[PDB]
Design a protein around this ligand. Structure first.
Ligand SMILES: NS(=O)(=O)c1c(F)c(F)c(SCCO)c(F)c1NC1CCCCCCC1
Ligand code: NA
Ligand SMILES: [Zn+2]
Length: 258
């Protein structure tokens, strides 16, 4: 009876195994755009993905992860609210059964169809497993997806999904350039928070871009053909793998713009 997204094991259940679910800096949150304050001390984000080395794509039974070589400083995030250098380790998405839901963060209560998370770890901590134990261990770049025009840079991901339909399947996924998933503007909101799945560790600096990317209806429909189950088990479509907004508590969301 492990955690997941269903009625019986979904977000409202997680606190029983992971009491940090009711903690002081949980994610995601609603971003109230009128309360978020512009912070002129924030810096432009530096997203340096030119040397990114993708390796593999894995259906882990919750989402799919596109994994990178993080054994040297290749693809890094710095600047913005961050001190120091964070190395890209993986990205993944959260999405809905319908276009009107699927994002984890919300903007003035608006849900997007999906949300991309590029996960990076603080190189001061030496590895990804040590970084998750630290209050400033991770930096996650969050990008909303809306349904409209296709995102050409997403198509290589969509096209491999049929090879990793079920939990525990993986496929080689080299030479994928994550710069093709970025919007035009790097304006962002930032706040301190957590992983959005168990173990729900409070180790994340969240950086959520204001400008969504557009993906096509066909692209997101392909995400919704994946399965949470393993091969040879009853089919459970991988949809609605998002945690709802959590209490902001004693936190301020800062804006890099306006
Ligand atoms: N939003 S997120 O970054 O918290 C996240 C998901 F929501 C996911 F659904 C997943 S799928 C694997 C769950 O074990 C994920 F890897 C991450 N990223 C992981 C990075 C930390 C190291 C592994 C522990 C799980 C979170
Ligand atoms: Na290496
Ligand atoms: Zn995520």
């Amino acid at each position: 009876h492990h955690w997941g997204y269903g009625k019986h094991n979904g977000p409202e259940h997680w606190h029983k195994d992971f009491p940090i679910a009711k903690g002081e800096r949980q994610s995601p949150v609603d971003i109230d755009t009128h309360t978020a304050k512009y912070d002129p001390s924030l810096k432009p984000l530096s997203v340096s993905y030119d040397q990114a080395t993708s390796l593999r794509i894995l259906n882990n039974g919750h989402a799919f992860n596109v994994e990178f070589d993080d054994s040297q400083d290749k693809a890094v995030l710095k600047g913005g609210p961050l001190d120091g250098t964070y190395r890209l380790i993986q990205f993944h998405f959260h999405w809905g059964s319908l276009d009107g839901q699927g994002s984890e963060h919300t903007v003035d209560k608006k849900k997007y169809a999906a949300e991309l998370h590029l996960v990076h770890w603080n190189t001061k901590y030496g590895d990804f497993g040590k970084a998750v134990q630290q209050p400033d261990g991770l930096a996650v770049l969050g990008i909303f997806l809306k349904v409209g025009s296709a995102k050409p840079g997403l198509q290589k991901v969509v096209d491999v999904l049929d090879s990793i339909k079920t939990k525990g399947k993986s496929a080689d996924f080299t030479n994928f350039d994550p710069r093709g998933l970025l919007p035009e503007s790097l304006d962002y909101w930032t706040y301190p928070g957590s992983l959005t799945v168990p173990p729900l560790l409070e180790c994340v600096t969240w950086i959520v871009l204001k400008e969504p990317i557009s993906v096509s209806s066909e692209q997101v429909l392909k995400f919704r053909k994946l399965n949470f189950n393993g091969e040879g088990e009853p089919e459970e479509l991988m949809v609605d793998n998002w945690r709802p907004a959590q209490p902001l508590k004693n936190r301020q969301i800062k804006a890099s713009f306006k």
